Design a protein around this nucleic acid. Structure first.
Ligand SMILES: C[S@@+](CC[C@H](N)C(=O)[O-])C[C@H]1O[C@@H](n2cnc3c(N)ncnc32)[C@H](O)[C@@H]1O
Ligand code: SF4
Ligand SMILES: [Mg+2]
Ligand SMILES: [Mg+2]
Lengths: 35, 326, 402
RNA sequence: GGACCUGGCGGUGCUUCAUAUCCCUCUAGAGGAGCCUGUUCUGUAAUCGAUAAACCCCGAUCAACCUCACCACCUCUUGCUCAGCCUAUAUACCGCCAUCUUAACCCUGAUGAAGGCUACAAAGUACGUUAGGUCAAGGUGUAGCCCAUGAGGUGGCAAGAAAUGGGCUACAUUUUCUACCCCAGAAAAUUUAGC
């Protein structure tokens, strides 16, 4: 973590695509319409 | 690490690049006189006079051309170092053709100058003796897509078998660039190929001005001498990536240069494979600088045929004249 | 349990271990990647030059998945138990609607000219590989068998005929091919003649019939049914066909289905039917035994909840959608006339062999009628048997004795 | 047995045309070199087997003189911590991906089968399923081995040949290099798609 970053120095919705579609297709994701 | 374009690759020429006046334009540059003095010390005759002012017929003899090319190549290395220190500093790959390989290793700090001259002298003498042993030669052939090379070699051997000889020899000895090869073997086979080019689909054929069949089994007698000469020499790890000719890859461990250098004597030269291993990259990626350190510009044309884009950033070190009298 | 650590030892007959390496042990039955004959591969592509565009790729995929996921037709008896159970829970029209769901709608496929091309583009290569693996079983373990006669019930595209030719082409003299569809018979003959309506058949002696002959007097050396018993409308039809095929079997009856639960259950019905002879006084009185893959005639130990299938990798016919090699998962049972050759039967590896550091996982159907999950290691079982299992693969035999 | 009705013809040929998909037509490449792979054969005792785990530090890369895997030999174990293994299992569950299944009325024929149109008009109107994949950005259990499926050491292993499938590079004169972004100077046959 920080130790790893230090030694290195020394050298959109987070859903599945389908679950996005169901929410997107049902109007459950705001502002995401179909072109 | 380094972006391609600020590094450099040094190409060392080989047999057939000698020219009268080679060495003029490098003589005044630093350290060159001492190299030629050491060459005089080791060989026993004056390379400087022969190279600067020669009949070209003594210079075309095998025993003389190879050491001359070796020394001229190294002198060009010192010239380039004087002119462009950064290029020598940023060197990624090195490659020699036939005898130029001995030069490249010396540039890579694997061998020392005197060791290299002794090895090259023994090599050239043994090769001349082997060429004297049996008549032979080489032919450069440029083919078209419908050309079959092993096929033509097979009938080239059939003809000489019909004439009568023990194991006729005719095989591709140098891969230079697409559809251009050099075949090597008995003169009758090469004459057969010349006269049957039309059947064999060879656009051009040109007998090389060479003593004998280099890079074939016909030079087996010369292998044992060179090995002895190379046994004493302690080859170190190359500082730069120096490529081989037997299989066209970077030398891994110094304990295998000893046998690969003797195997090159009786094996084809994988020049096209070496050019690929050095310059192949994806479309759009930049290419390194290329410097042909030695006499002539043959490797430049070969690179143009192999990889045009890599040839775009190619330059040759002038070993016949100099712009500025240092 | 055919593997007892420290007790079971490799079976060294013919002086195997001394005279041959372990990679070539007699239980090795793996077949290298199957390539179809060039005449067949060329013929299939030529027949499809008319229409092999983007539509065909979709059609071939739809047919392939539809056939793979088919269930056996639901016999009425299964239907009333489902009907009553739903009836009790509800406490007729409502039950039927709830029965259309949770039950499989089984439909006949009328193999017309159009759907016969799609089948050939989808199953010719796959079907050929599965049958080739099955026949390899008979050749490898009985290389002296030289059949002169062959029948193929459900001859759609002739894959069985081609596969039989590739193995027993020097002795077979008659290939009886049966298929009720006129279009499939028309397609199968074109494929024998280089994919053209006019030509010389590539294999000699092929006979095409639309109806299955029913007579015990005529008896064939090898009777084959590949991916055909799943097209029959009911269990009664499957019962009747398999009885006739066995009555006309001389040496071997090779049945091959999909490697699914529907396929495996189908073959275990047929396996029990032949083993449990019901005919009082048959013309051929010889008994029957399972030549492969089962090492026993006892009921299947995997039929309860699991299945039993095998895999054969093959090179698909070059098409606009076939690039990489595929695998053909299939179920098989081979029934042979007579009695087992010897008492030294060997377990069958029925599942992929997992090679792990210093130990190997083998799932074996043992001669005693039980499955055994064996983790074979050099320390427990021995250097020889571990190396034999290290090189073994799915569908091979493990040479173990006592 | 006589007369009649609806038919189906899983129909067959010819005639004419609509005749788009596919033909002809147009553009473009796709053979040849060099290397990397997929499959086969041969060979070994063995794996040209792998780096959330090494060389390689121009591009890439091979074997590295690394570690894991493999082969042949050996050593220790109550060990580490009531140790340790990543070993199996989603063919145990869940999650996630994917397959497949889920009309009435009015007339005509004598109130027979049956039939019903003419426009300058003659009865016609209205959820389950899966020996499914995924143990890499996720979990809950279940089993195995523990004088070895744990921990080590000494050597070896680093393949060869084709025919075909694919992929990566350079391939130029209507070109290349410099200045500019277009009035300058120097170089030298099958197919496959596509409108
Ligand atoms: C799924 S195909 C089998 C494919 C073939 N075994 C192969 O490997 O290519 C089944 C064939 O059996 C035929 N068939 C279905 N029912 C039949 C029956 N009752 N009697 C005879 N043939 C039948 C069908 O016409 C169909 O062509
Ligand atoms: S091999 Fe074993 S598991 Fe497979 S079908 Fe036969 S008895 Fe069943
Ligand atoms: Mg699963
Ligand atoms: Mg290895």
């Amino acid at each position: 973590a920080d130790e790893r970053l230090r030694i290195n120095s020394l050298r959109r919705w987070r859903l599945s695509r389908i679950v996005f579609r169901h929410l997107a297709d049902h109007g459950q994701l705001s502002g995401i319409q179909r072109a | 690490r380094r972006m391609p374009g600020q590094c450099s690759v040094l190409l060392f020429p080989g047999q057939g690049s000698q020219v009268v006046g080679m060495g003029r334009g490098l003589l005044n540059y630093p350290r060159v006189r001492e190299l030629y003095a050491a060459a005089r010390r080791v060989l026993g005759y004056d390379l400087l006079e022969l190279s600067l002012h020669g009949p070209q017929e003594t210079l075309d003899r095998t025993v003389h051309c190879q050491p001359a090319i070796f020394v001229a190549s190294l002198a060009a290395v010192e010239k380039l170092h004087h002119l462009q220190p950064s290029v020598i500093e940023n060197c990624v790959a090195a490659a020699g053709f036939s005898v130029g390989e001995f030069a490249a290793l010396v540039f890579a700090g694997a061998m020392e100058f005197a060791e290299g001259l002794y090895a090259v002298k023994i090599r050239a003498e043994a090769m001349q003796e082997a060429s004297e042993a049996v008549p032979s030669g080489m032919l450069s052939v440029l083919g078209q897509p419908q050309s079959k090379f092993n096929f033509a070699c097979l009938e080239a051997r059939e003809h000489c078998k019909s004439l009568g000889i023990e194991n006729p020899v005719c095989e591709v000895s140098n891969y230079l660039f697409p559809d251009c090869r050099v075949i090597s073997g008995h003169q009758e086979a090469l004459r057969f190929l010349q006269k049957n080019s039309s059947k064999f689909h060879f656009r051009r054929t040109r007998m090389l001005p060479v003593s004998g069949a280099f890079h074939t089994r016909l030079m087996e007698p010369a292998v044992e001498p060179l090995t002895q000469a190379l046994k004493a020499v302690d080859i170190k790890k190359p500082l730069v990536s120096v490529y081989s000719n037997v299989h066209a890859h970077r030398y891994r461990h110094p304990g295998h240069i000893h046998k690969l250098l003797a195997q090159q004597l009786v094996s084809p030269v994988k020049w096209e494979q070496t050019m690929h291993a050095i310059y192949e990259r994806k479309k759009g990626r930049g290419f390194p600088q290329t410097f042909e350190v030695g006499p002539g510009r043959q490797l430049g044309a070969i690179l143009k045929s192999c990889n045009m884009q890599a040839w775009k950033s190619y330059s040759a070190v002038d070993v016949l004249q100099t712009l500025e009298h240092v | 349990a055919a593997l007892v650590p420290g007790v079971t030892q490799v079976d060294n007959k013919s002086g195997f271990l001394q005279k041959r390496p372990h990679r070539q042990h007699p239980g090795i039955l793996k077949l290298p990647h199957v390539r179809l004959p060039q005449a067949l591969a060329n013929g299939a592509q030529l027949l499809l030059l008319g229409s092999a565009g983007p539509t065909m790729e979709n059609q071939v995929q739809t047919l392939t998945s539809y056939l793979w996921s088919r269930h056996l037709p639901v016999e009425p008896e299964e239907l009333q138990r489902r009907a009553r159970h739903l009836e009790k829970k509800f406490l007729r029209g409502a039950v039927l609607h709830a029965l259309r769901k949770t039950t499989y709608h089984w439909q006949e496929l009328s193999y017309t000219e159009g759907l016969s091309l799609v089948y050939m583009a989808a199953r010719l290569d796959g079907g050929f590989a599965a049958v080739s693996r099955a026949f390899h079983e008979i050749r490898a373990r009985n290389p002296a068998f030289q059949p002169q006669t062959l029948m193929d019930f459900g001859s759609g595209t002739g894959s069985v005929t081609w596969a039989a030719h590739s193995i027993w082409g020097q002795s077979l003299r008659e290939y009886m091919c049966v298929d009720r569809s006129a279009a499939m018979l028309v397609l199968a003959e074109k494929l024998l003649k280089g994919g053209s309506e006019s030509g010389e058949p590539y294999i000699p002696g092929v006979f095409f019939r639309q109806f299955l002959p029913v007579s015990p007097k005529v008896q064939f050396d090898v009777v084959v049914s590949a991916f055909s018993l799943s097209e029959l409308p009911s269990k009664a039809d499957r019962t009747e066909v398999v009885q006739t095929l066995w009555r006309k079997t001389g040496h071997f009856l090779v049945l091959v289905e999909n490697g699914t639960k529907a396929g495996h259950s189908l073959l275990m019905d047929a396996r029990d039917l032949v083993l449990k002879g019901k005919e009082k006084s048959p013309l051929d009185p010889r008994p029957g035994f399972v030549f492969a893959p089962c090492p026993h005639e006892l009921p299947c130990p995997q039929l309860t909840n699991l299945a039993c299938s095998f895999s054969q990798a093959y090179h698909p016919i070059p098409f606009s959608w076939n690039k990489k090699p595929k695998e053909e998962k299939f179920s098989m049972v081979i029934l042979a006339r007579g009695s087992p050759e010897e008492a030294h039967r060997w377990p069958r590896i029925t599942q992929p062999v997992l090679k792990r550091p210093r130990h190997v996982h083998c799932h074996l159907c043992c001669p005693d009628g039980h499955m055994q999950h064996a983790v074979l290691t050099a320390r427990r079982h021995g250097r020889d048997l571990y190396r034999c299992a290290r090189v073994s693969s799915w569908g091979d035999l493990l040479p173990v004795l006592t």
